[PDB]
Amino acid sequence: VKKNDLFVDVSSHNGYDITGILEQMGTTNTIIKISESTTYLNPCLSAQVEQSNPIGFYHFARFGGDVAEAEREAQFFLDNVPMQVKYLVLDYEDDPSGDAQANTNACLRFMQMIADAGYKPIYYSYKPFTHDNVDYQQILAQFPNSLWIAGYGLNDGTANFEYFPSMDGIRWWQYSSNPFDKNIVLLDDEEDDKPKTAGTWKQDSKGWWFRRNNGSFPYNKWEKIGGVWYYFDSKGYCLTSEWLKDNEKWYYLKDNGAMATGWVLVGSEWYYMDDSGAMVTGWVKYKNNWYYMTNERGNMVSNEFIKSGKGWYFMNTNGELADNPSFTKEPDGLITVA
């Protein structure tokens, strides 16, 4: 998954049919409850797996601050993982001990075991609980960017940035349980592999071209090099800081030539491209601020509305704000948080 992707998390509380909530949510990404303690298994596991595309599974912790117990709970969990996925989650939100350090050590042990098994460990919880019962800084010390934090705000079923939990290392955000658990991804999955580069970059007085291994070079095409997409013009130079329309869609090649993904600053204006590099039009929220973006006839427009109090204010060409809010009721657009 990548920044701003969504996923649902379920347990027996969701039943043997989760096709409905996956449709409402508009994704098949799930994290499914496998187990709890050393003796309980979610009986809906196989149906839920079957109806979705899991990116992880989770375990509901009951070990408190007892390390030996955490070990046994991890093994029971691991022994019941039905398929390989990137992540396995430690759901730590109940039965903490009085000793906050014992709690931390037991969490670290659970997590260390998931790693040793060849998965990425995640610590899941909510802020006030985490603050009272562990040293999360010690978790992040061993497992950077491994947190999945819950913080619902008004819990009205949408992601509302005002209530974003502030903690270091948050990878994913459970932003609501109304009417089922909803999550948004804050960080791209890690890709700790040496990128390829099937050739060598050359710079001449006109620009950058790519000499492939075989001596030829890309021209009039997209080509992925070192994991990154570039577009090369008819003369073999990669485009830089330029718009490109390809098959009806709009792409933006950054100053280093890489196809923009996500929010990208073009001069002084913000544009949002999806995971594929294709510009998204209409209303898109960027944390607290709203942008209405269009590209009719190749005329690229980014209407920015800056938040202030309960209102949002249009920003003119001269970077000037109106005295009064342009709107107080948010449009129903795409919410991004990064």
* Active-site residue set: 9, 91, 93
CB atoms closer than 10 angstroms to residue 329: 8
Contact assessment for residue 261 and residue 277, using Cβ atoms and an 8 Å cutoff: yes
Contact assessment for residue 27 and residue 183, using Cβ atoms and an 8 Å cutoff: no
Relative to beta strand 242-246, strand 249-253 is: antiparallel
Contact assessment for residue 187 and residue 161, using Cβ atoms and an 8 Å cutoff: no
Alpha helix ranges (H) inside the chain: 19-25, 45-50, 67-79, 100-116, 127-133, 136-142
CA distance 101 to 23: 42
Instruction: Report DSSP state, residue 58.
Output: E
Q: Does residue 21 sit in helix, strand or coil?
A: helix
Residue 42: its H or E element: none
Q: Which strand ranges, in their side-by-side order, compose the sheet holding 301-308?
A: 311-314, 301-308, 289-294, 282-286, 334-336
